[PDB]
Structure 1
Amino acid sequence: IVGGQECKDGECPWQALLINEENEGFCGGTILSEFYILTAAHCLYQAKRFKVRVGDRNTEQEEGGEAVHEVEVVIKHNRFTKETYDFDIAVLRLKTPITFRMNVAPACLPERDWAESTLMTQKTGIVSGFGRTHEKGRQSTRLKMLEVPYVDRNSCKLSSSFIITQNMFCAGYDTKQEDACQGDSGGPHVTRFKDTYFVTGIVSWGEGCARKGKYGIYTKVTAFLKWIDRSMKT
């Protein structure tokens, strides 16, 4: 995350972090329930064996809420394509259930029509992660969050050198120095409505980080609600 603020105690409890063999983060996720994590399909090609960590806000100290979980099954969208990042979505089933507590809780899955007409027409969403703090910088040891405006679809299409499919949306700023970045991919995009937070997107891709005339591109979760429901039944 470029810019934004630190998540304070209890503020981003649905954050998951995918960690490699060396206990290093390479992507994010969203806690959907005690057995399931939402992430990006493209993240799966970034490590041979990985685990999932929840309840962590500072990777340099022990806070008391941290828990590591092994993955039982990977469910990747079969229509995912590396050339365009279309259908960039996957669900992970964990071997043991997540025990909810301070800093460990799920985000809500919305219904499609209400989310599209009411949530995605709000001024902003919230993105979060342990990714780079500057395009060429190193990964953050602190969990960060950032408020990002929804961007007009036509403007987004004009600004992009790469195709924006019906399965993607845009968010962020034209020139202001605030955006998601490398390592945040697969992480939560959520929208607040009357003090309840609903999943609205998955951190997907971007031409650099916080570049002028460029936006952040997110998987459109609302196009995948029946798909997500099927995956969570097996």
Structure 2
Amino acid sequence: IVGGSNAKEGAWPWVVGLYYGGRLLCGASLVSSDWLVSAAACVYGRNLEPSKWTAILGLHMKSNLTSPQTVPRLIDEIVINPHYNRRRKDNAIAMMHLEFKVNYTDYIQPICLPEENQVFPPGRNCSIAGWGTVVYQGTTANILQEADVPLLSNERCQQQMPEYNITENMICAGYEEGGIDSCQGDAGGPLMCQENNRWFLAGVTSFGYKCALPNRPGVYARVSRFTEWIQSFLH
């Protein structure tokens, strides 16, 4: 996918991995003590059997699931946003309920949701996370990657990718010359923006056209307008 870098231990405590059938299929974020926020597209068609989903909290390396800092958990309830379409790829955000609960620790922390009428200005650098690949396809990296990419306004996003509706329900991040992206390969985590002195769940990894290609913005699911829906299930 190009653009990844090394991630320190505990750098992203709210990034968790989702395993279905023994393989890392998608990613999620830790918001509360019993709920996760993940992409609805990658969990579609597998919500009838939540027992087959393995939620790994505090994961740092693909083949090092032995440290005590990582506490595996199961998923019992899976809910998908009713506004999802699967044809326009609109509102690809779904929530997964943990088995019982998770104890807060240094390497496992929640992430604050955006408040009402809180929009991150475009052009502000934000971090991305996920267990993506170095090349466009294949050769999955065993170490969590991190990169900084400024937000792209939807006005130019709808023109740079004249294939979707985009509308106001998506947030685009990318570069004019490309190089840094997280849309394809594997989500493995959401889009995080930090203002004041704390990160926020600004976006969730979504579909895309190409990785490390110029004039190919990376689409991310907008969470500012979905704060109420998430908070309805958080408590």
Q: TM-score by structure 2 length?
A: 0.90
Partner of 1:109: 113
Partner of 2:17: 17
Partner of 2:157: 156
The 2-side partners of 1:122 and 1:215 are apart by 13
Partner of 1:100: 104
Structure 1 unaligned blocks of 5 or more:
none
The 1-side partners of 2:215 and 2:68 are apart by 42
Partner of 2:212: 210
Q: Name the CA shift for 1:225/1:181 in 2 (closer, same or farther; >3 Å).
A: closer
Structure 2 unaligned blocks of 5 or more:
none
Aligned to 1:56, the other structure's residue is in SS state coil
**CA root-mean-square deviation:** 1.8
Q: Name the CA shift for 1:103/1:122 in 2 (closer, same or farther; >3 Å).
A: farther
- Which stretch of structure 1 is more off in the superposition, 217-226 or 156-165? 156-165
Whichever residue aligns with residue 36 of structure 2, its letter is I
Pair 1:78 & 2:82 matched: yes
What do residues 76-128 of structure 1 show as CA deviations (whole Å, max 9, x unaligned)?
11121111111111111111211222321111112121x21xx3346111110
Partner of 1:29: 28
Equivalenced residue count is: 229
Pair 1:231 & 2:233 matched: yes
Q: Name the CA shift for 1:156/1:111 in 2 (closer, same or farther; >3 Å).
A: same
Whichever residue aligns with residue 147 of structure 2, its letter is L
The 2-side partners of 1:10 and 1:185 are apart by 19
Q: How far off is 1:180 after superposition?
A: 0.5
Q: How far off is 1:138 after superposition?
A: 2.2
Whichever residue aligns with residue 87 of structure 2, its letter is E
The 1-side partners of 2:172 and 2:122 are apart by 13
- Which stretch of structure 1 is more off in the superposition, 134-143 or 182-191? 182-191
What do residues 17-63 of structure 1 show as CA deviations (whole Å, max 9, x unaligned)?
110222x2111101001101001111113656211101111122233
Aligned to 1:16, the other structure's residue is in SS state strand
